[PDB]
Design a binder for this molecule. Structure first.
Ligand SMILES: [Cl-]
Ligand SMILES: [Cl-]
Ligand SMILES: [Cl-]
Ligand SMILES: [Cl-]
Ligand code: NA
Ligand code: NA
Length: 129
């Protein structure tokens, strides 16, 4: 599924991401835009052989099992393909574990490089939430 901007913000808000660990909703929408262009079916290979999956590009080295990342973990206890669903529950619940790991949203390189220090509230401007 390709979400609209405000549709994704509302979905994220209902699943409890708004101000989760102090990150206002616009941070999450900004990260999703630059990680996946709001497409739940996004996948992208990494140089180390791991793969990033779904709307928040969650990687198979640490967080999910895809059966082809040797020596990896599965800390969200899910198959990586669950992260490609039109239902974002698994992505959101796994992202809550990631953002709580110690480095906050800096775990998402694209958030650090494209969202951190910018007016992220612009990403939810105009939305009925
Ligand atoms: Cl947009
Ligand atoms: Cl914030
Ligand atoms: Cl959903
Ligand atoms: Cl933090
Ligand atoms: Na915001
Ligand atoms: Na894995």
């Amino acid at each position: 599924k390709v979400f609209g901007r405000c549709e994704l913000a509302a979905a994220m808000k209902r699943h409890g991401l708004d101000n989760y660990r102090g990150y206002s909703l616009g941070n999450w929408v900004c990260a999703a835009k630059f990680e996946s262009n709001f497409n739940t079916q996004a996948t992208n290979r990494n140089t180390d052989g791991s793969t990033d999956y779904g709307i928040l590009q969650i990687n198979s080295r640490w967080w999910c099992n895809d059966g082809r990342t040797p020596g990896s973990r599965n800390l969200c206890n899910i198959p990586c393909s669950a992260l490609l669903s039109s239902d974002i529950t698994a992505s959101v619940n796994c992202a809550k574990k990631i953002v709580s790991d110690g480095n906050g949203m800096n775990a998402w390189v694209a958030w650090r490089n494209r969202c951190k220090g910018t007016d992220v509230q612009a990403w939810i401007r105009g939305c009925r939430l």
